[PDB]
Each structure stands twice: as structure tokens, then as C-alpha cells.
Amino acid sequence: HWGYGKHNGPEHWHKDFPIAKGERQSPVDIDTHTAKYDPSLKPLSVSYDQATSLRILNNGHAFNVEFDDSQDKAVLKGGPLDGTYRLIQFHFHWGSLDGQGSEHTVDKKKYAAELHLVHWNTKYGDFGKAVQQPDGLAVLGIFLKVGSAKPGLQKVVDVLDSIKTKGKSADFTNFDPRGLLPESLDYWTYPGSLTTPPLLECVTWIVLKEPISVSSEQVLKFRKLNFNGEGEPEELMVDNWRPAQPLKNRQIKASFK
Ligand SMILES: O=C1NC(=O)[C@@H](c2ccccc2)O1
Ligand code: NA
Ligand SMILES: [Zn+2]
Numbered sequence: 312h313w314g315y316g317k318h319n320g321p322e323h324w325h326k327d328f329p330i331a332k333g334e335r336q337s338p339v340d341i342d343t344h345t346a347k348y349d350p351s352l353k354p355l356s357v358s359y360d361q362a363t364s365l366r367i368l369n370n371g372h373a374f375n376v377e378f379d380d381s382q383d384k385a386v387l388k389g390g391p392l393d394g395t396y397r398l399i400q401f402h403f404h405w406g407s408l409d410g411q412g413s414e415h416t417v418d419k420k421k422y423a424a425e426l427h428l429v430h431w432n433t434k435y436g437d438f439g440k441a442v443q444q445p446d447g448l449a450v451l452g453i454f455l456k457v458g459s460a461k462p463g464l465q466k467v468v469d470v471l472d473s474i475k476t477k478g479k480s481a482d483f484t485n486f487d488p489r490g491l492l493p494e495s496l497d498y499w500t501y502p503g504s505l506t507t508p509p510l511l512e513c514v515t516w517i518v519l520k521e522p523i524s525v526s527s528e529q530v531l532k533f534r535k536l537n538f539n540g541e542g543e544p545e546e547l548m549v550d551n552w553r554p555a556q557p558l559k560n561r562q563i564k565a566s567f568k
Pocket of ligand 2: 346562
């Protein structure tokens with residue numbers, strides 16, 4: 312099955328998932344000089360005050376912090392979006408070294424990691440129905456650079472020892488995702504896809520311009536996770552990112568001048 316190695320990585324995904332070569336695949340390079348300011352875009356409304364985190368899971372591809380999405384609690388509205396999108400989970404993609412790890416790039420720059428907060432459009436009732444729709448999902452992407460520590464990330468870092476291998480989970484209640492945001496909510500947006508199989512073309516991407524800083528020690532802990540299950544040969548969970556894909560007939564819009 313699919314992964315990030317030589318024999319099962321991004322260059323192989325199209326065999327099982329032919330949409331890998333589709334018309335609106337993600338991630339992409341954001342060419343900042345050609346992303347046009349769109350004065351009709353609205354400020355992003357991030358309403359996370361009532362978020363209920365539940366659990367953290369190593370799924371063999373990343374670690375997901377999962378939320379109660381059975382009701383309108385943590386929601387994303389505004390920006391390029393019509394209606395209301397509920398937060399279901401967040402996770403990261405990261406590198407083996409600080410010079411790579413992000414999925415999106417900015418003028419070809421790769422960041423050390425990228426946070427994805429995944430939301431689904433409540434007009435479709437459940438996540439599974441939302442991923443059958445071209446406007447089913449909204450993913451808020453946030454770049455990570457290595458510098459000062461991010462205090463709001465440390466609770467995540469400190470639980471990782473308990474979910475080292477694929478299939479392990481741990482209770483993870485009362486985590487506030489507001490502590491992972493940068494100051495500014497200025498963003499770029501474009502229509503795209505999931506960046507892993509099944510690569511479904513359901514996503515309004517909202518990529519924040521301002522990275523967050525995390526410390527070297529924080530990202531080093533991400534890199535001690537394992538892709539493998541317990542009692543299998545150890546494969547460090549690093550370089551779990553898909554490279555940039557062809558932009559094709561799309562335009563990236565900026566929310567800011
Ligand atoms: O942007 C994405 N990051 C991923 O891991 C992938 C994704 C796969 C499955 C569910 C939600 C998101 O899409
Ligand atoms: Na453009
Ligand atoms: Zn992701």
C-alpha cells in the first residue's frame with residue numbers, strides 16, 4: 312500500500328489512484344508575484360473557542376489530532392468560503408531535515424513542516440458525503456519554520472512518545488488549536504485536492520502567509536515517530552510530504568495587498 316518510500320511514494324500513487332494526475336491536484340508552488348490580490352475575498356473567520364479535541368492517532372502516515380465534529384463547535388467561515396466548515400482533525404507533514412517538509416512551497420521555498428487543519432462543509436451532513444463534492448472540504452495550511460518554540464505545540468510534542476508506531480492512539484482532550492495559529496490571518500487560496508491518497512479533488516485550500524516558529528527540539532520529536540507498526544522494522548516517520556503538482560488551469564488568489 313501507499314507511503315512515502317522509493318517503492319510506494321508519490322511517483323507510484325497514480326497506479327492505484329489515477330486522479331493523482333488530475334486537473335486540481337495539491338500541493339502547488341505559490342508564485343507570490345503572480346498571485347493576484349482579490350479585494351472581494353473576506354477575512355477568514357476561525358472560531359475555535361469551543362473546540363473539543365478527543366484523541367491523537369499515529370495512522371502510519373502522520374499523527375492526527377481528532378475533534379468532536381458531531382456539532383458546530385470549531386468552525387471555519389468567511390474568506391473564500393460559502394457557509395460553514397467543521398474542524399475534524401489536524402496533522403502535519405515534515406522533513407528529515409529543516410530544509411524540507413512542507414507540501415506547499417512559496418516561490419519554491421520549502422518550509423520545515425506544514426500544519427493542515429481539515430474541515431468539512433456542513434451542508435453535506437458528514438465528512439464521507441463531503442468528500443464526494445468539489446466544495447466539500449476546506450484545509451487551513453500553516454507553514455512551520457525552525458526558530459523559537461511554539462508554546463501551544465508542546466502538549467502535542469509531549470504525547471508523541473505514547474503513539475510511536477502505526478495504529479497507536481492516546482486520549483488527547485482539551486487541546487486548544489488556537490495556540491497553533493500565527494498572528495496574521497492573511498492567506499492565499501486556490502482549489503485543490505487531498506495531498507495523500509485518495510487524492511480527492513474536494514478542497515478549498517487556504518494557506519496562511521505567516522509561518523509559525525517551532526523549536527528544533529519540537530520538530531526533532533516529530534522525526535522520532537515511526538511509519539511502521541509495533542514489532543516491525545523501524546522506519547522513521549520523516550519526509551511524509553508530496554511535492555508540488557502542476558497548477559494547470561487554476562489561479563491562486565491573495566487576501567492581502
Ligand atoms: O491535505 C491533506 N493532508 C492529508 O493528509 C490529506 C488527507 C487525507 C485524508 C483525510 C484528510 C486529509 O490531504
Ligand atoms: Na494569478
Ligand atoms: Zn495534510
